[PDB]
Amino acid sequence: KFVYKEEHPFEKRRSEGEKIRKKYPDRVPVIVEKAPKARIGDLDKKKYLVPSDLTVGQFYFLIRKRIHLRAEDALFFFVNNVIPPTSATMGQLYQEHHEEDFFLYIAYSDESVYGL
């Protein structure tokens, strides 16, 4: 679903994810990639290490900058096809939605429905 998963075998991702969680347990490792059909800027770096207290809204501010989004432009995150609340912390998202490789996966779109 994620290009990160096609280029990196599961065992490699999982070993990396376990190590990153051990070294920085107060932080969340995140893979961010554009959702299919999204009409929006490409992201230059996909792998992030974020404070667990960072909110989804603060992460939006950071991602919007990197993709050069205008003030009128919408940005939406999806984790397992669900839009997380902008007030949620990245740690809350990680607990409920991390994958078996110990990464949290976020798709982003200009559309409020994933893959629309």
Partner: peptide, 27 residues
């Protein structure tokens, strides 16, 4: 360009971007 205030490149992995704890103050 070098990122320092809100983000920084991971020293070991140029491919992991580290968001600083100061980014938790953003509004």
């Amino acid at each position: 360009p070098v990122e320092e205030l809100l983000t920084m490149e991971d020293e070991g992995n140029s491919d992991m971007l580290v968001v600083t704890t100061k980014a938790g103050l953003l509004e």
